[PDB]
Amino acid sequence: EEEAVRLYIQWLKDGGPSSGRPPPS
Numbered sequence: 001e002e003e004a005v006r007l008y009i010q011w012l013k014d015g016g017p018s019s020g021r022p023p024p025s
Contacts, residue, residue, distance in 0.1 A: 008024045011023055
């Protein structure tokens with residue numbers, strides 16, 4: 001694991017792609 005996946009899963013928590021943001025990978 002790693003932050004940016006953590007963050008990403010946080011991205012995902014934000015909707016992932018539905019966040020409006022691209023995945024932090």
